[PDB]
């Protein structure tokens, strides 16, 4: 399985853009302007239509990747075990070949 790691959204109340891109897998560098977020304290900051929303996310493995994973394999020439029992006059024994 995959875990969608998304950090807390970035609100910056100046309106100046801020774009960056690191090397961890599948960043989606998206920046939004003119957002006016709300909060239980009514609202925060003063300026409207001039705000920066920086929201980023990526994917990673899961915590149970050690156990719940599945594996793939390729076929090839195959060797066969054979457990044989041999007996004759006053002798009776098993082996493995």
């Amino acid at each position: 399985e995959y875990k969608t790691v998304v950090p807390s959204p970035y609100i910056k109340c100046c309106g100046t853009s801020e774009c960056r891109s690191m090397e961890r897998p599948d960043y989606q560098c998206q920046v939004y302007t003119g957002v006016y977020p709300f909060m239980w304290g009514g609202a925060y900051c003063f300026c409207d239509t001039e705000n920066t929303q920086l929201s980023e996310a990526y994917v990673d493995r899961s915590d149970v990747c050690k156990h719940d994973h599945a594996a793939a394999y390729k076929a090839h020439t195959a060797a066969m075990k054979a457990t044989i029992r041999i007996s004759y006059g006053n002798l009776n024994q098993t082996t493995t070949a």
């Binding site: 995959y2 959204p9 909060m39 929201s55 996310a57 990526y58 994917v59 050690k66 994973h69």
Partner: protein, 97 residues
């Protein structure tokens, strides 16, 4: 493909170069409150587990029960085996008996 099987095709459990093609896509948050909207198809691993069905144990063309420890298949008949044996002269009596 994003969702069929092995959407993550990461290599051994050493966790290096975790390739992923799960097709993230962000969206602009609404003006109501803070949002982190994104579109994410469900994991193909879960779908493959849910569908599964008719394991190879019930598909062996010779009723060959399969185990998994050294990925082995046991107790199935096909063909025939040759044998060449050498018997010492001391393992049997002479014609005088």
């Amino acid at each position: 493909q994003p969702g069929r099987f092995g959407d993550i095709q990461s290599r051994t459990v050493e966790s290096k170069d975790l390739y992923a093609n799960t097709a993230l896509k962000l969206s602009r948050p609404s003006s109501g409150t803070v949002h982190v909207p994104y579109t994410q198809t469900p994991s193909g691993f879960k779908y493959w587990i849910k569908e599964r069905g008719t394991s190879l144990n019930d598909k062996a063309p010779f009723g060959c029960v399969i185990k998994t420890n050294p990925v082995r298949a046991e107790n199935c008949a096909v063909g025939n085996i040759p044998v060449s044996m050498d018997i010492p002269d001391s393992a049997f009596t002479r014609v005088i008996d």
